[PDB]
Design a protein around this ligand. Structure first.
Ligand SMILES: O=C(O)[C@@H](CO)O[C@H]1O[C@H](CO)[C@@H](O)[C@H](O)[C@@H]1O
Ligand SMILES: O=C(O)[C@@H](CO)O[C@H]1O[C@H](CO)[C@@H](O)[C@H](O)[C@@H]1O
Ligand SMILES: [Mg+2]
Ligand SMILES: [Mg+2]
Lengths: 251, 251
């Protein structure tokens, strides 16, 4: 069994911490069940949370593996090997400039904003905001509600893809949580361990995650997607509920 | 006679340069008529143009005087003397945060953006964008057209004042081109010379300028505001026409 999990609004609470998930995470480790973060967050953010690889960052744009992963894949980088599935940030940013000219209006993202600004917009600290700005693949867009749709049309026109997390729209090319999950499973050392995958999430960018796993659990607000299990409460309490009710009684 | 003039879209061409205005400016200089910039631009931007004080920056937020101005006013600041009429930028920025809370959405300004982003948004060079970001009183806002109305009400509700230049809305408190022109006229060494003031402009932020002078000339693109003279062509060609037709005969 592998548990693939989104962070914001799923494993993490409103302050970007664990809440009741802590105990749930420990039980899984004790049972030897790998837990793989799959998030819109950057590697720098995942690191600051003390999460060890493997993990999937920037909506599936990058798969970070331990340097000594038993299956050879990716490009070595320090204590990691990195499998890049998506276009680099710089290329996305260049494409955004063309989308701007098309939309006939500015399209702003984290790359355009100071860390101070990103912090204010996200409620993160300036330092956490600096980590959120260290994007390798995916751009987080800052859009006024009323312009969203015109912007999305322009993104697609210039070859970019979009999704949204809990609060923000994203632009990237080749970043998909489902693609990344499928890839990581294919690269898993023990095929039997990866045979059954669970995926938990709460927003649009998690749909691909749900599709790519065997047991999908939605811990967001409202009704889950079709074919996805639900929990009584959202977020980390959802995660806890999910492990205890759906996972442990299988372990 | 003193000629008070806006810069962008009035004295400056589309590239923000004085080239086309040279001949008309030299006509005034040769006749010993002082010319005072009155602009939304910052001290740094005005200096980069090689314009000497007295000049009025940031929509009237600051009045800059020569170090040896005969009438002692304001305080020494970097080789000039400055008379601060408006709240400092820092206070405006803080009150903007209250506005954001009321509006329920981000309200972005230059202070939130990198020089690179400002450069892209304005067409200024990266160097010029840094100068445009060196704001002491007034914030230039970057707003979705669809959100302007809600945003402007939010500004009013938190005690900020707004206006707009050729392209951008602004927020400040106590910055009014008319108030600054009146203060400079009152601090003028030669009361006779200041007795007859001319004001030229092309946008909303110039209405206060027109109210504060004895002869107002509009060089923007619409019909002129009531009580203001028009010119056959906008911008620097309008400024030149006004000098030749309205001012020289009077001199
Ligand atoms: O789309 C969003 O709402 C979240 C995921 O739900 O990701 C963005 O927002 C987060 C801050 O809330 C950042 O940590 C991420 O890096 C990214 O910029
Ligand atoms: O409101 C505007 O459209 C113009 C009019 O002067 O000023 C802003 O825009 C200019 C750039 O076009 C900057 O040089 C100014 O500092 C200011 O930010
Ligand atoms: Mg989430
Ligand atoms: Mg103007």
């Amino acid at each position: 069994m592998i548990v693939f999990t989104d962070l914001d609004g799923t494993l993490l609470d409103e302050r970007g911490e664990l809440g009741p998930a802590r105990e749930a995470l420990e039980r899984l480790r004790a049972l030897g069940v790998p837990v793989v973060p799959v998030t819109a967050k950057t590697r720098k953010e995942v690191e600051a949370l003390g999460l060890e690889p493997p993990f999937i960052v920037e909506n599936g744009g990058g798969l970070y593996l331990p340097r000594d992963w038993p299956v050879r894949a990716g490009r070595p980088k320090g204590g990691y090997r990195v499998v890049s599935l998506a276009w680099p940030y710089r290329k996305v940013r260049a494409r955004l400039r063309e989308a701007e000219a098309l939309a006939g209006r500015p399209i702003l993202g984290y790359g355009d904003l100071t860390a101070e600004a990103v912090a204010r917009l996200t409620g993160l600290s300036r330092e956490a905001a600096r980590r959120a700005k260290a994007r390798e693949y995916d751009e987080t867009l800052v859009l006024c509600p009323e312009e969203v749709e015109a912007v999305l049309e322009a993104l697609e026109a210039v070859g970019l893809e979009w999704t949204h997390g809990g609060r923000f729209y994203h632009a990237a090319k080749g970043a998909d949580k489902g693609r990344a999950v499928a890839r990581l499973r294919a690269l898993w050392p023990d095929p039997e361990e990866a045979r059954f995958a669970v995926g938990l999430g709460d927003s649009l960018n998690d749909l691909p995650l749900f599709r790519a796993v065997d047991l999908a659990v939605y811990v967001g607000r409202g009704d889950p997607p079709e074919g996805v299990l639900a929990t009584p409460a959202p977020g980390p309490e959802g995660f806890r509920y999910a492990v205890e009710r759906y996972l442990l009684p299988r372990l």
